[PDB]
Amino acid sequence: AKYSELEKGGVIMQAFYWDVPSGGIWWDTIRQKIPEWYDAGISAIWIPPASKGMGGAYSMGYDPYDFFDLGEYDQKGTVETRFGSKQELVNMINTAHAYGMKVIADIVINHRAGGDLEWNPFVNDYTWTDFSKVASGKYTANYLDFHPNELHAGDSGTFGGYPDICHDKSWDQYWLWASQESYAAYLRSIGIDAWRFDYVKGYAPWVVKDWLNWWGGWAVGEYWDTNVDAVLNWAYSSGAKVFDFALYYKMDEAFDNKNIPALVSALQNGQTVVSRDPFKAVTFVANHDTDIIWNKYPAYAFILTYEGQPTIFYRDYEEWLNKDKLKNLIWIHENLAGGSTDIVYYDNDELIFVRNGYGDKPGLITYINLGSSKAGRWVYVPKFAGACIHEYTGNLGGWVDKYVYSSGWVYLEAPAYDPANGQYGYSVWSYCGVG
Ligand SMILES: OC[C@H]1O[C@@H]2O[C@H]3[C@H](O)[C@@H](O)[C@@H](O[C@H]4[C@H](O)[C@@H](O)[C@@H](O[C@H]5[C@@H](O)[C@@H](O)[C@@H](O[C@H]6[C@H](O)[C@@H](O)[C@@H](O[C@H]7[C@H](O)[C@@H](O)[C@@H](O[C@H]8[C@H](O)[C@@H](O)[C@@H](O[C@H]1[C@H](O)[C@H]2O)O[C@@H]8CO)O[C@@H]7CO)O[C@@H]6CO)O[C@@H]5CO)O[C@@H]4CO)O[C@@H]3CO
Ligand SMILES: OC[C@H]1O[C@@](CO)(O[C@H]2O[C@H](CO)[C@@H](O)[C@H](O)[C@H]2O)[C@@H](O)[C@@H]1O
Ligand SMILES: OC[C@H]1O[C@@](CO)(O[C@H]2O[C@H](CO)[C@@H](O)[C@H](O)[C@H]2O)[C@@H](O)[C@@H]1O
Ligand SMILES: [Ca+2]
Ligand SMILES: [Ca+2]
Ligand SMILES: [Ca+2]
Ligand SMILES: [Ca+2]
Ligand SMILES: [Zn+2]
3-state secondary structure the chain: CCCCCHHHCCCEEECCCCCCCCCCCHHHHHHHHHHHHHHHCCCEEECCCCCEECCHHHCCCCCEEECCCCCCCCECCECCECCECHHHHHHHHHHHHHCCCEEEEEECCCECCCCEEEEECCCCEEEEEECCCCCCCCCCCCHHHECCCCCCCCCCCCCCCCCEECCCCHHHHHHHCCCCCCHHHHHHHCCCCEEEECCHHHCCHHHHHHHHHHHCCCEEECCCCCCHHHHHHHHHHHCCEEECHHHHHHHHHHHCCCCHHHHHHHHHCCCCCCCCCCCCEEEECCCCCCCCCCCHHHHHHHHHHCCCEEEEEHHHHHHHCCHHHHHHHHHHHHHCCCCCEEEEEECCCEEEEEECCECCECCEEEEEECCCCCEEEEEECHHHCCEEEEECCCCCCCCCEEEECCCCEEEEEECCEEHHHCEECEEEEEECCCC
Contact 244, 269 (CB under 8 A): no
Considering only CA atoms, which of 90, 69, 93, 92 is closest in space to residue 81? 69
What does the alpha-carbon distance between residue 316 and residue 73 come to, in Å, rounded to a whole number? 34
Cα(227) to centroid(ligand 1), Å:
23
To 5 degrees, how large is the angle CA 318–CA 99–CA 303?
A: 45
Question: Burial of 26 by CB count in 10 Å (0-12 exposed, 13-18 middle, 19+ buried)?
Answer: buried
Neighbours of 151 (CB within 10 A): 11
Distance 376 CA to ligand 7 centre (A): 9
- Encoded amino acid at 96, one letter: A
Which ligand has an atom closest to residue 218 CA?
3
Residues whose CB is less than 8 angstroms from the CB of residue 219 and which lie 6 or more positions away in sequence, other chains included: 194, 195, 196, 197, 208, 211, 212, 238, 239, 240, 241
Closest CA to 300 of 257, 333, 273, 268: 333
What is the residue with the minimal CA distance to atom 20 of ligand 3?
239
Cα–Cα distance for residue pair 95/279, rounded to 1 Å: 28
Burial class (CB in 10 A: 0-12, 13-18, 19+), 420: exposed
Q: Identify any residues that bridge with 343 across adjacent strands, giving them in sequence order.
A: 353
| Cβ partners under 8 Å of residue 429, min gap 6 | 364, 365, 366, 367, 384, 389, 390, 391, 392, 402, 412
182 lines ligand 1 (CB under 6 A): no
Using an 8 Å Cβ cutoff, are 275 and 241 in contact? Answer: no
Contact in structure between 298 and 259 (CB atoms under 8 Å): no
Q: Within its chain, how far is the Cα of 345 from the centroid?
A: 29
Q: From the CA of 215, give the closest atom in ligand 3.
A: 23
281-284 and 309-313 beta bridge pairing: parallel
Phi first, then psi: what are they for 285, rounded to 5°? -100, -30
The residues lining ligand 2, judged by C-beta closer than 6 Å to any ligand atom, are: 68, 136, 138, 181, 185-186, 189
Entry resolution (Å): 2.1
300 burial type by CB count under 10 A (0-12 exposed, 13-18 middle, 19+ buried): buried
Length of the chain: 435
Report all structural domains of the chain as residue ranges with CATH numbers, in order of start. Answer: 1-337 (3.20.20.80), 338-435 (2.60.40.1180)
- Chain centre to alpha carbon of residue 80: 26
Ligand 6 ion: nearby residues, β-carbon < 5 Å: 252, 256, 292
Experimentally, how was this structure solved?
Answer: X-ray
Secondary structure of 113-157 in the HEC alphabet? CCCEEEEECCCCEEEEEECCCCCCCCCCCCHHHECCCCCCCCCCC
Q: C-alpha distances in angstroms, 401 versus 324, 398, 435?
A: 21, 10, 14
- 73 CA to centre of ligand 4 in angstroms: 13
Ligand nearest to the CA of 172: 8
Q: How far is the CA of 37 from the centre of ligand 2 (A)?
A: 31
Q: Please list the residues that pair with 45 across neighbouring strands.
A: 13, 103
In contact, 410 and 402? CB cutoff 8 Å: yes
Query: Which residues lie below 8 Å from residue 422, measured CB to CB, with a gap of 6+?
Result: none
Residues 125 and 133: beta-carbon distance below 8 Å: no
- Which atom of ligand 2 has the smallest separation from the CA of 86? 15
Q: Is the CB of 334 under 6 A from ligand 1?
A: no
Contact 66, 81 (CB under 8 A): no
306 contacts: CB under 8 Å, gap ≥ 6: 274, 283, 337, 341, 353, 355, 366
How far is C-alpha 4 from the chain's CA centre? 16
Atom of ligand 3 nearest to the CA of 213: 23
Question: Residues lining ligand 3, CB < 6 A?
Answer: 7, 212, 216, 218-219, 239, 241, 280
Measured from the alpha carbon of residue 219, the closest ligand is 3
Identify the bridge partners of residue 4 per DSSP, sorted by sequence position: none
CB atoms within 10 A of CB 119: 12
> Minimal CA–CA distance to 411: which of 374, 372, 379, 371?
379
